[PDB]
């Protein structure tokens, strides 16, 4: 007695975070399979989280002048609040996620012409300076822009914050405030450009996500 084949009434599918439970069910219909067509269309590393979010972004820039006095703040910036924004394609990743955590890495650049002189100071301070005295900023991770020698610095911080992970729609308070001050005022010759540019870069590290959701829209 060979039994005839039994129709499968109940079967379960699933993907990513998703689930279905189906009573009409039946087997799935494939054709072909994954393929590698050995003449490659575009030979860059294929896109992925590694590809996208990890990359650098120009963030904020301001020119730096002579008339700034000691510790006149040239730059009060926020890491996070600026990244999240319409202007990037990294925007995509966050805007669909509620919770994220990450490390930060920063580049800072200027181009003093060697006839100029002065120095700048880059401090990465969580929260805010608050009433913490100016003088001590070097305690924080930092580098010293110096017209003489270094034209560039690189700072790297891992995650520091009081809760589990940051939340974009309703940030408690900005994680990393990026402060920049006039460390030694710019003194110039005569006819030299009395100004000089300043730029900033950023990228996430070990970026992790949670909580897909449309509600961002």
């Amino acid at each position: 007695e060979q039994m005839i084949q039994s129709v499968d009434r109940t079967a379960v599918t699933g993907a990513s975070y998703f689930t279905s439970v189906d009573q009409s069910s039946v087997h799935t219909a494939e054709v072909g399979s994954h393929q590698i067509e050995p003449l490659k269309t575009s030979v860059d590393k294929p896109g992925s989280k590694k590809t996208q979010g990890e990359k650098f972004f120009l963030i904020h820039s301001a020119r730096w002048l002579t008339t700034h006095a000691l510790f006149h703040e040239v730059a009060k910036l926020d890491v996070v609040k600026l990244l999240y924004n319409e202007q990037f394609a990294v925007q995509g990743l966050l805007r669909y996620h509620t919770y994220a955590r990450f490390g930060i890495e920063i580049q800072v650049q200027i181009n003093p012409t060697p006839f100029q002189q002065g120095g700048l100071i880059c401090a990465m301070v969580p929260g805010d300076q608050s009433y913490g005295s100016i003088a001590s900023l070097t305690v924080y991770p930092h580098g010293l822009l110096n017209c003489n020698i270094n034209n560039v610095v690189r700072i790297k911080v891992p995650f520091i914050y009081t809760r589990g992970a940051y939340h974009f729609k309703d940030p408690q308070y900005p994680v990393w405030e990026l402060t920049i001050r006039v460390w030694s005022e710019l003194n110039i010759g005569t006819g030299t450009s009395a100004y000089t540019s300043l730029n900033v870069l950023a990228r996430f590290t070990d970026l992790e996500l949670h909580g897909l959701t449309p509600l961002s829209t």
Binding site: K50, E54, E105, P141, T205, D206
Partner: peptide
């Protein structure tokens, strides 16, 4: 794995 490229040494502070 984290993708950091560089020529120069990476180090620590404080």
């Amino acid at each position: 794995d984290s993708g950091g490229f560089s020529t120069t040494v990476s180090t620590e502070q404080n």
